[PDB]
Amino acid sequence: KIEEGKLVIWINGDKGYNGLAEVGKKFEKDTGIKVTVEHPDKLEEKFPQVAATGDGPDIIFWAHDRFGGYAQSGLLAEITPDKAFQDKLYPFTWDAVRYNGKLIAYPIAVEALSLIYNKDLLPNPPKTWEEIPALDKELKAKGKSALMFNLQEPYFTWPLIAADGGYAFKYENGKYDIKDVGVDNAGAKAGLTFLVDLIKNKHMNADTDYSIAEAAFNKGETAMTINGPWAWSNIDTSKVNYGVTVLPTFKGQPSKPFVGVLSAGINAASPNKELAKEFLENYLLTDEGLEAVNKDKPLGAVALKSYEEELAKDPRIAATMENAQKGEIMPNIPQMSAFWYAVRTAVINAASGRQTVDAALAAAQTNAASSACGRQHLEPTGTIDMRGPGQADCAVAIGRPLGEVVTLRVLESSLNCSAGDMLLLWGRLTWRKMCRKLLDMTFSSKTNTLVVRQRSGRPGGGVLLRYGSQLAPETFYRECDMQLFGPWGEIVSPSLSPATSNAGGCRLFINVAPHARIAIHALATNMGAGANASYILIRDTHSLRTTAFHGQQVLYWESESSQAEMEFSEGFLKAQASLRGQYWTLQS
Ligand SMILES: *[C@H]1O[C@H](CO)[C@@H](O[C@@H]2O[C@H](CO)[C@@H](O)[C@H](O)[C@H]2NC(C)=O)[C@H](O)[C@H]1NC(C)=O
Ligand SMILES: OC[C@H]1O[C@H](O[C@H]2[C@H](O)[C@@H](O)[C@@H](O)O[C@@H]2CO)[C@H](O)[C@@H](O)[C@@H]1O
């Protein structure tokens, strides 16, 4: 699907592709072979699907974090340089591109977020994070902002969360303990509580972007931004007289920015292996080579010992290297993907004040754990990557409270459609089944629950989709109806006043994770002394078998579904009876 005697490359748009392409053109002249350099959007999420097919580029450039999943996926080919070549590079960088004791990617440069500040507006920058909100006011006065950086990507926000506490995948016994990540630790929660403070206290817009912030700082609208070596190239062309210093310090600790190693991976399917090795070792990883690239957009600390000794002189590096030291290297594994999406949501959901910092991180912590076919729920946003799951029968449930509805957008699709692969959005009052053109089309529940089966036999054939919630466009649940739907929990009869709306008894929806049944133990009182009147009925939402409870005391009942609801009789409410108990799950 890729063709021979020619190299294709996917670098990130926010890096020097013009400079690289220049190296490709000198390579094209001396070698005599074509070099094409694309920079497609979302290439981090897209290269997998496209190389997984056997197509994609001959080379790919990305920070070493994603490369472990790519290696695990079988997409990457084993790079095997001579001791003579390996000795020209900081062996620390080789240690970032080594999966299962195999090198999978050529290391190019070490990046890390520094603090960039306008020397003009700000002569001395802040030492602490804590002294910015004061500094914002002191710049609101002058009609300005102290700090603007991308709050969408987590890479940027992470340093402040990880300053005090906050880790991702512990290093225990010289390995990453995937069952033990920091995310929901008081250090992280306090670190994220502070970011939320600044948005709350109107110092940072809850939705700044990279372009927004890159332009706001470059114009001089804002005093500080947070960015890596690639960013300077455009700030330079704004004559801002900008500084690059150490990140400010949270709760006494310094900020801990993740360290990226830009690494150039070679595609499993590439019939041009020999050339890629020839291009990167002989041509790109050379002082003459790396200069060209650093020029268009600065690389920062380079893998090449020879050429890194020079940049070390410029203090923009030194600031970065000093920031690199305070922070930790990026885990070079697959579960990074799970980790990333989990945090991005945790930021967004809680930065959009639709999630408590605790609630957001706790959800994010559990999200970086096992398989994707569990249950999502009580998350404004969410990114379910059901691609290449263990069962190709990946069912997953979403749950917001009453008064809300669920949005859903498919982001990537690698389903067979024809064999029988398809999606399925079963709802209370919704139902949709699809394949074919499901890409980039918005779907909607009409209610607070939603569940999404994925029938696809292709081992790595699954879909990646993002979801959200929205305010009830109409609303029609009569308030008193409550919604409790967790792994397990408490049960209380609701009540209402003698007048209000007597017609229609309240219900109680409890929807749980799929392929799990809900169990109800509960005891009810105040019923008092044909079957009379005033009772409680219970059934699964999509079943007609309703077991009622007439003049009862203690009651036990099991679902045969994730979805369930029990209804309280208009009689039972008018007669003022009450019920309490617990509910649980996990039984298939
Ligand atoms: C789903 O459709 C794909 C189309 O690619 C089918 O793959 C084909 O398999 C048959 C072998 O019986 C041949 O037509 C080719 O090997 C494949 N297609 C092409 C164009 O090469 C696949 O078989 C279908 N799923 C099922 C259930 O068979
Ligand atoms: O989710 C955060 C994101 O962080 C990194 O992306 C960085 C990247 O390291 C830099 O090389 C450059 O591309 O800027 C990005 C931030 O927008 C990880 O490489 C990536 O996997 C991760 O998703």
Residue numbers in the entry: 820 to 1348, 1352 to 1410
Question: From the publication, what sentences describe this entry?
Answer:
ADAMTS13 is a plasma metalloprotease that is essential for the regulation of von Willebrand factor (VWF) function, mediator of platelet recruitment to sites of blood vessel damage. ADAMTS13 is a ~190-kDa multidomain metalloprotease (MP) with an N-terminal domain organization comprising the MP, disintegrin-like (Dis), a thrombospondin type 1 (TSP) repeat, cysteine-rich (Cys-rich), and Spacer domains these N-terminal domains are termed MDTCS. ADAMTS13 function is dynamically regulated by structural changes induced by VWF binding that convert it from a latent to active conformation. The Spacer-CUB interaction is central to ADAMTS13 global latency, and disruption of this interaction modulates ADAMTS13 function.
The CUB1 and CUB2 domains both exhibit a jelly roll fold with antiparallel stranded β sheets typical of CUB domains. A disulfide bond covalently links CUB1 loops L2 with L3 (Cys1192-Cys1213) and CUB2 loops L10 with L11 (Cys1299-Cys1325). CUB1 and CUB2 are connected by a short linker loop (Leu1290-Glu1298) with the domains aligning in opposing orientations related by a ~180° rotation of the jelly roll structure. The central interface involves six hydrogen bonding interactions between Arg1247-Asn1330, Asn1267-Gln1302, Arg1194-Phe1304, Arg1194-Gly1305, and Arg1194-Asn1330 and a network of hydrophobic contacts. On either side of the interdomain cleft are two pockets: (i) a deep pocket (P1) composed of residues from CUB1 β sheet #1 and CUB2 loops L12, L14, and L16, and (ii) a shallow pocket (P2) composed of side chains from the linker loop, CUB2 β sheet #3 and CUB1 loop L6. This is the first structure of tandemly arranged CUB domains that lack the β1 and β2 strands (a hallmark of Ca2+-binding CUB domains) that does not bind Ca2+ (31). ADAMTS13 CUB1 and CUB2 have N-linked glycosylation sites on homologous loops (L5 and L13, respectively). We identified six amino acids (Trp1245, Trp1250, and Lys1252 in CUB1 and Arg1326, Glu1387, and Glu1389 in CUB2), which, when mutated, resulted in the near-complete disruption of Spacer-CUB binding. At the center of the interface, the hydrophobic patch consisting of Leu591 and Phe592 (both L3), Leu637 (L7), and Leu668 (L9) in the Spacer domain interacts hydrophobically with Trp1245, Leu1248, and Trp1250 in CUB1.
